[PDB]
């Protein structure tokens, strides 16, 4: 269909990239795995703020932690309930970090989502955060020259 995946978006990891220069910090790249998890097509996601994944059981306190991170241009790692297109719930161990250019200005934000069936703690939380941070570092490389 529309918006065939770029090579970046075929990286076998769940992430999105947003452009904070664009009204409402919208998604501009979304990986195939993100599409698969969320049940949206790429055309349905692009140019939208990622908050469309939130729903009734999403903890708004947690959403404010993300808002504040973006506002302060800093990373955050949180867990929150998200919803697919068809309204199926999933937990999202979510890591955000800015991507900076060669003058240290924030160019994009990188978001990595690890979907799970439950809030994780201890070993599962640690291994999850290990995974999403390593992924974010990989994408910071991948995205640098877009």
Q: Which residues are annotated as a binding site for Ca(2+)?
A: 43, 46, 105, 115
Q: For residues 97 and 87, give the distance between their C-alpha atoms in angstroms, rounded to a whole number.
A: 27
Question: Which token pair is 124?
Answer: 């599962």
Judged by CB under 6 A, the residue of 30, 35, 45, 66 near ligand FMN is 66
Q: Which residue is nearest to ligand FMN (CB)?
A: 111
Choice between 68 and 127, CB closer to ligand FMN: 68
Choice between 3 and 52, CB closer to ligand FMN: 52
Binding mask 11-50 for ligand FMN (x = CB under 6 A): -----x-x------x-----------------------xx
Size of the site for ligand FMN (CB under 6 A): 21
φ/ψ of 107, rounded to 5, equals -100, -45
Per CB under 6 A, residues contacting ligand FMN are 16, 18, 25, 49-51, 53-54, 63, 66-67, 70, 80, 82, 92, 94, 96, 109-111, 113
């Amino acid at each position: 269909g529309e918006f065939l995946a770029t090579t970046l978006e075929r990286i076998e990891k769940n992430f999105v990239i947003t452009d904070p220069r664009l009204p409402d910090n919208p998604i501009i790249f979304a990986s195939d795995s993100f599409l698969q998890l969320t049940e949206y097509s790429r055309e349905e996601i692009l140019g939208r703020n990622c908050r469309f994944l939130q729903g009734p059981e999403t903890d708004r306190a947690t959403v404010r932690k993300i808002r504040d991170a973006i506002d302060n241009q800093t990373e955050v790692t949180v867990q929150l309930i998200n919803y697919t297109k068809s309204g199926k719930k999933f937990w999202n161990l979510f890591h955000l970090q800015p991507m900076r250019d060669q003058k240290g200005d924030v160019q994009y934000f990188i978001g990595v989502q690890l979907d799970g069936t439950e809030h994780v703690r201890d070993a599962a939380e640690r291994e999850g955060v290990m995974l999403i941070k390593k992924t974010a570092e990989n994408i910071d490389e991948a995205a640098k020259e877009l």
